[PDB]
């Protein structure tokens, strides 16, 4: 619905990325108050990282736009996808997502 | 940092899942204001899904709330060569997924 959170002269938008998009990096089209812009997501990006799109905030002074990464998942994988997910789980076995607890 | 957000008589906690855990499903140990519980995460789980854990909310001699494990997908650090090759194959296998469908 409304796409932007207003924080002072800045704008923030939730940027949904497929997990492979965050891991590999990707070039994504992101909407602004006027026209869309191509944003380069760096490889290895994390949930919640703020990608700054300088100059695309409120043109009061001219603020920035921040695309805040949220990782989104496709639906239940089919068998081919599961096998790959299992390999990746094995590949990244050292990763502890609940290191806090 | 404090783990539980209070909402009326219910508690809410961020449940961090690696993407393979959300896709494949998993059984996770979740903390409570007392004893940790065992929670089943279904395969195909989605970001922001609210998984209920009855009775683990705020206890009062009148009413006991629930605890909700809210899913947040988290990523490891930048991948090595093999992991990168697996991410590519996953991307190709799930090429149909459009996370930015909305836009």
């Amino acid at each position: 619905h409304p796409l932007f959170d207003i924080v002072g002269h800045n704008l923030e938008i939730v940027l949904p990325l497929a997990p492979w998009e965050a891991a590999l990096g990707a070039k994504v089209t992101v909407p602004t108050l006027k026209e869309s812009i191509l944003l380069t997501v760096p490889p290895g990006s994390q949930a919640g990282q703020r990608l700054r799109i300088k100059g695309k905030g409120l043109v009061s002074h001219t603020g920035d736009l921040f695309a805040v990464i949220k990782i989104v998942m496709p639906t239940k994988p089919d068998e081919k996808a599961r096998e790959l997910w299992q390999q990746l789980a094995a590949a990244e076995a050292s990763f502890d997502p609940r290191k806090t607890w």
Side-chain angles (χ1 to χ4, degrees), chain A:
Chain A
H1 313 261
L3 275 38
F4 310 94
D5 260 322
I6 311 180
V7 180
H9 310 117
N10 296 334
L11 291 182
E12 305 193 350
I13 179 167
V14 173
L15 170 63
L17 291 180
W20 45 87
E21 288 180 318
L24 299 178
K27 294 194 166 59
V28 173
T29 293
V30 177
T32 80
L33 290 183
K34 282 176 163 276
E35 47 195 325
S36 305
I37 60 73
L38 204 55
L39 171 65
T40 298
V41 171
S45 286
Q46 304 291 310
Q49 217 161 12
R50 297 166 55 84
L51 305 179
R52 191 189 186 191
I53 302 170
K54 152 278 195 163
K56 305 310 184 188
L58 295 160
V59 63
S60 169
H61 174 82
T62 57
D64 302 347
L65 177 61
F66 298 87
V68 178
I69 299 178
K70 166 187 177 184
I71 300 301
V72 294
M73 301 292 296
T75 58
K76 192 197 293 178
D78 77 313
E79 67 173 344
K80 177 49 180 161
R82 295 193 304 267
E83 289 165 3
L84 292 175
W85 284 111
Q86 292 171 343
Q87 288 194 235
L88 198 55
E92 295 291 57
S94 68
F95 179 57
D96 189 344
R98 290 170 294 279
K99 193 175 176 181
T100 290
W101 305 347

